[PDB]
Amino acid sequence: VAQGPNGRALAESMNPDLLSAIQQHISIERYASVTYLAMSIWCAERELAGFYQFFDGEAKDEQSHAVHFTQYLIARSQSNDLQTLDAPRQNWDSLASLMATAFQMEADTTSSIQSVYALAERNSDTRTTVFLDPLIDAQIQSEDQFAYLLGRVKFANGDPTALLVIDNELRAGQTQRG
Amino acid sequence: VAQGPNGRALAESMNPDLLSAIQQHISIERYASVTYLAMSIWCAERELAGFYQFFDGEAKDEQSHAVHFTQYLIARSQSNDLQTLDAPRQNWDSLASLMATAFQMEADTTSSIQSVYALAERNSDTRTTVFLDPLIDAQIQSEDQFAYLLGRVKFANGDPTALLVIDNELRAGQTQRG
Amino acid sequence: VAQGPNGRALAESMNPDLLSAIQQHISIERYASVTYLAMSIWCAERELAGFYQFFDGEAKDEQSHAVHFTQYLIARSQSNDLQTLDAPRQNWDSLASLMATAFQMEADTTSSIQSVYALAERNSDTRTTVFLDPLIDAQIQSEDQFAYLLGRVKFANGDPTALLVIDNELRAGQTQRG
Amino acid sequence: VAQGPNGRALAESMNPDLLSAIQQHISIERYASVTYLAMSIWCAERELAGFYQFFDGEAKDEQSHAVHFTQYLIARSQSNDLQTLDAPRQNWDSLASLMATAFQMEADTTSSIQSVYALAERNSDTRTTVFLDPLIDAQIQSEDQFAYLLGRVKFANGDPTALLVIDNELRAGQTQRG
Ligand SMILES: [Cl-]
Ligand SMILES: [Cl-]
Ligand SMILES: [Cl-]
Ligand SMILES: [Cl-]
Ligand SMILES: [Fe+3]
Ligand SMILES: [Fe+3]
Ligand SMILES: [Fe+3]
Ligand SMILES: [Fe+3]
Ligand SMILES: [Fe+3]
Ligand SMILES: [Fe+3]
Ligand SMILES: [Fe+3]
Ligand SMILES: [Fe+3]
Ligand SMILES: [Fe+3]
């Protein structure tokens, strides 16, 4: 039995470029987390309590995704390399602008997973494509959800009255089309 | 065993300037109470039933704070001196103006506690600083809450439709960021 | 009513040096979080599942502390400034060495809070000292706990059999003196 | 409607090389089963009752996997061909050596599935890749688990006291990192 780079027994070696791609993706999830924390704060500063609660939960969920990836590297007997984390964006001129950045962050998270997925396919790493499949499914749902929240905020057309109604929807847990 | 100014057994003497400061602060709490009663009436006169219910409860809570301070003076064997109470402000041109006065009243209540706190520190009265600590913590929460309600009302920008939505939030008990 | 730096109604201005100190402390809590994540991974790589579960939970708790501080700045109408986060330490020669770093991290977190506390006292910011008081109390308990875990691991004197017994204690939730 | 090789109605023909690969993989699962039975006996002979119970259950699970594959061939209207089964390895010099063989058996089971998966992809048999996807996911978890058990036994460094502690973990159902 061979030992993997993290010292555990190795079921199958992993291409170093694929390993680097996964370590980088963990940073993307962690950056999404702190970005949603920054968004939760921006909303709290403007008394948008439902949006604050929504993004507070999204920040925790993205961190959970990051940890889920670290556990996969452990399972593959590969080293983790937790990286320096950039500061998030913290300033927006409007809730519509913030929601556009949130949607982009979600789509960019999927693009990062897709990049890892393609590298795994090039290397015939079927464990990794199988690991990523449910995460892509979750990304479809999250993109659908963020397109819903962004679209509803844009429909409001900057009317504070409409944004208060939507804020109350989010506080109530009404966060997707259903 | 020595007897304190109110006749009870005295654990430790209190500086007369600190005692006067606490008696004055009791008046501040009582004045906050009648101010919130006046605000509850102003809101009721304009059919803002959620704001009326909110300020009706705040009036009762501030009175409870006043009584809590009278009990501390009893516990310290100090005399209470219940004072003449000024009439509250009763007229405002808008809900936003009323909410600004409410926020100021809350911040001024904290400033009064801070003034007592500093005098207790000058006199090394650790019983009094310990007594005030949880009241300052409650003031942080109340200032946060009143900044939330004021900010949400200002966001409404005088639109009656938005103010009705917020009024319904308050009637439902949705009175802070959460 | 004045507006604070984050745009909310301002109960009382905050010294900019104190604000910077709190923003820096938020980074300390976030760094403790990712440090405990790195420790959880190191333990998982060596099949120390109880230590892995313990540090996984500590990472989540430190993040919660960070968010708790961001909420205080919101409550004080002060700006948050989420900072670049350094990469954590990730390599240790032994569990005893890891636990020494964990204890130091906990003590250093308290030192950071103490530094903020002293600055608040210099500025007579009683809201901030009151806010920090329960966090210092929690730090006493955490230092006591980490001294317990470190001391028990050192008592084991590197015997794998003893470290397995302690690992099972932690998996069972037996993480302090009680 | 065409009839498949096993006589049932045929939804889509299967490449004979892919069919042979699946029939061979069924033998791999059955061989893993009898290997884990042999390991359970070796552990029982040495009073390692927790390891005996663990491998007794693994033997039953691998047989279930084999039957799951036979049901897929039925579903595809393909013939099953149950093969002669080799005798398992039955002798080991130590528990650490046994656990290394167990880990290798698990990794080799995954390699067999990967071989079938690649053949299905070459033949554009999407039913088969979809069928195998959750089995690969289960293999990741099993490899992670067996790396955990092997690593913990190796950490024990042959100390009977440590092996008794681990044996009791397994009897209690504590068989993975969690
Ligand atoms: Cl907007
Ligand atoms: Cl108004
Ligand atoms: Cl050690
Ligand atoms: Cl052994
Ligand atoms: Fe994510
Ligand atoms: Fe996401
Ligand atoms: Fe009060
Ligand atoms: Fe008050
Ligand atoms: Fe902390
Ligand atoms: Fe801590
Ligand atoms: Fe199997
Ligand atoms: Fe298996
Ligand atoms: Fe799938």
Automatic annotation (TrEMBL), chains A, B, C, D:
| Taxonomy, superkingdom | Bacteria
Please verify whether the record's keywords include Lipid biosynthesis: no
| Residues at which Fe(3+) 3 binds | D133
The UniProt annotation places Fe(3+) 1 binding at E29, E62, H65
* UniProt binding sites for Fe(3+) 2: E62, E106
Entry keyword set: Metal-binding
Classification lineage: Bacteria, Bacillati, Cyanobacteriota, Cyanophyceae, Synechococcales
Name of the molecule in the record:
Ferritin
